[PDB]
Fold this protein.
Amino acid sequence: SSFSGKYQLQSQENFEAFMKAIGLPEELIQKGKDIKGVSEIVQNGKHFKFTITAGSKVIQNEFTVGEECELETMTGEKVKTVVQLEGDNKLVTTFKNIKSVTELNGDIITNTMTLGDIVFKRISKRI
């Protein structure tokens, strides 16, 4: 279905503030800031595989929409949460006080993570 795709990053806002506050070693931060990572999605109805790639940081995630799951975050840290389908195209979850919205509009996925007052937004494009 609906999200399924290779995508790769185009633009992003506020990488830095965000990745600070989340608990990142500022070393591999500024390496990170200008990497354009690639997202593989497989959607089978309500079941998702998310494969993010930055370097040979593979993190690989899966969830079923509506049910509990365990997501590896950008830290390595693994968190129990639920991803929900508010639309047929926008995936919403909260982990560690981050609001994560993931939106497909056509061939562009937009991801907005939000930790307090910081808005970390990633625009990616289909390949």
